[PDB]
Each structure stands twice: as C-alpha cells, then as structure tokens.
C-alpha cells in the first residue's frame, strides 16, 4: 500500500507536489526518511514522462509540476529544465535515478533524517 504521513488526503498531495518540484531545482534535499521513501516513486515516474518528450507528456507533467523559476538569468521554468537537462543527462539509464543516504536523528523530536539526491 502507501502511507498517509499524518495528513489529510488533500494536504498529502500538495506536500508531495512541493517536494517533487523542489528536488528538480536543487538537485539534493534533506527530509525525514519516510518522506524520502514515499517521494522517490513519484519523482522517478515524472522523469520518465520527460524522457518521452511529446506534447501530451509535456501537458500531463504540467498538471503536476509547480511553476517556480528554476534558473535565473535564463527565465527557465522548472518544466523547461526538466525537459531540457535531465532528459539528456540520463538518456541511457533504465530506471533508478535516485539514492537515499541516512544520517543521525534530530534534536527537536528525535526523527530520523535522510538526504535524497539525483544520480
């Protein structure tokens, strides 16, 4: 199955969207372990849509990828970055564009943390 992450069905979707949009821009994040484990699947699904490279694809991804500037001095939307750079970067791999690396706990509430990045 999947995990509910302690949110309602409508905030879970928004949080997943925000995380998958930030990962594209920053190339590496750090969140909890459960969030990373539930995020890698959606991010991998999005990458493949981009690799296809069509108008239907572009439009499907558009209805999920938040609209934030991904590169200054280039007026590059995050969608344009996804369909331009990453697709050529991983043009030969067959799946598995992510890796998760664990760290120590957190001081405030003892949560376990992890770093998720693109490979």
């Amino acid at each position: 199955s999947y995990r509910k992450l302690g949110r309602t069905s409508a905030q879970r979707k928004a949080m997943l969207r925000d995380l998958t949009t930030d990962l594209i821009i920053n190339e590496r994040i750090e969140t909890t372990e459960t969030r990373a484990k539930e995020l890698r699947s959606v991010v991998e699904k999005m990458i493949t849509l981009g690799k296809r490279g069509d108008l239907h694809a572009r439009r499907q991804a558009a209805a999920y990828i938040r609209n934030e500037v991904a590169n200054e001095e280039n007026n590059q939307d995050a969608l344009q970055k996804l369909f331009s750079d990453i697709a050529t970067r991983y043009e030969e791999r067959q799946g598995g564009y992510t890796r998760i690396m664990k760290l120590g706990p957190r001081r405030g509430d003892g949560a376990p943390m992890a770093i998720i990045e693109l490979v």
């Binding site: 690396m101 664990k102 760290l103 120590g104 770093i115």
Partner: protein, 54 residues
C-alpha cells in the same frame, strides 16, 4: 478506580526491572574511524563509501 492500598518498595523495584534502554548498534569507519552508527553516514569523518557527507 482508586488504589485500595499504598504500594511498597519491593513491588515498585520489581516492576521497574524492564524500564531500561540498550546500547546502540555502532561500528567504526574505514577512513578516520569515529565509531558511527551502522548503515549511516557520519557527521565528521565516518565517510560513507567515499567522502564524509556531513
């Protein structure tokens, strides 16, 4: 719903036997070993399979 009698010291001490915590599962790093946690990247020099990430 209210205790009938007070609790002695023997019963209290007997009940507290399982209220304890264990040692962590930890091992040192090949490069500048600093006795980190197993399957985790250390924060000073326990360089996980390469560089020391943090």
């Amino acid at each position: 719903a209210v205790p009938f009698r007070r609790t002695s010291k023997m019963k209290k001490r007997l009940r507290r036997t399982h209220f304890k915590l264990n040692v962590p599962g930890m091992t040192e790093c090949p490069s500048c070993g600093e006795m980190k946690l197993s399957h985790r990247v250390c924060k000073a020099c326990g360089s996980y399979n390469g560089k020391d990430i943090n």
